[PDB]
Amino acid sequence: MNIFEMLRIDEGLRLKIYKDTEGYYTIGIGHLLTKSPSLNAAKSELDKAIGRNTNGVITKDEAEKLFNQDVDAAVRGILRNAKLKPVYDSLDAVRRAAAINMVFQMGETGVAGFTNSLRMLQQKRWDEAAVNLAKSRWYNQTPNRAKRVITTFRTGTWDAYK
Numbered sequence: 001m002n003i004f005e006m007l008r009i010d011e012g013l014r015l016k017i018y019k020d021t022e023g024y025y026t027i028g029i030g031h032l033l034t035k036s037p038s039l040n041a042a043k044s045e046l047d048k049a050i051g052r053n054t055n056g057v058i059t060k061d062e063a064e065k066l067f068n069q070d071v072d073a074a075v076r077g078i079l080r081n082a083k084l085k086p087v088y089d090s091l092d093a094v095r096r097a098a099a100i101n102m103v104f105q106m107g108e109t110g111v112a113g114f115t116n117s118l119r120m121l122q123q124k125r126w127d128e129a130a131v132n133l134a135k136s137r138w139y140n141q142t143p144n145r146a147k148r149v150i151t152t153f154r155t156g157t158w159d160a161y162k
């Protein structure tokens with residue numbers, strides 16, 4: 001296990017434009033294309049991302065390339081966020097992957113309400129943090145995935161992904 005294998009499990013792999021859990025156009029390994037309801041707009045974003053006329057379909061190599069970029073950008077964003085960086089740096093590598101998972105899914109805006117969870121995580125109050133994290137739209141809308149991520153934070157192990 002590592003962040004790549006973890007997110008590949010949670011996001012899956014689809015080579016044609018599909019809608020994610022929120023109804024947004026997406027491709028590959030959870031690569032959000034746009035929040036616009038326009039499929040043409042999504043197709044435009046895809047072509048721009050890949051660098052060719054894709055007509056809504058990409059290869060596995062192309063999917064993995066975008067994925068690698070997306071993971072890189074996610075973790076780098078964490079380090080550039082004054083609130084997230086100190087919590088991230090306090091974590092071990094397994095829990096760091098759980099952190100990146102959340103940011104991949106929700107973005108930095110999506111985790112701005114997690115102030116109290118973040119404090120509990122930095123404090124290493126793992127059970128309390130796990131309880132706090134579940135008190136969320138995130139948990140309610142994607143419970144199976146959230147439970148996996150939360151278990152990773154609670155235990156510092158990959159048990160939820162084995």
Ligand SMILES: Fc1cccc(F)c1CBr
Nearest residue numbers: 084087088099102111114
């Ligand atoms: F603990 C962290 C550190 C950085 C990002 C993040 F989503 C988390 C889980 Br609310």
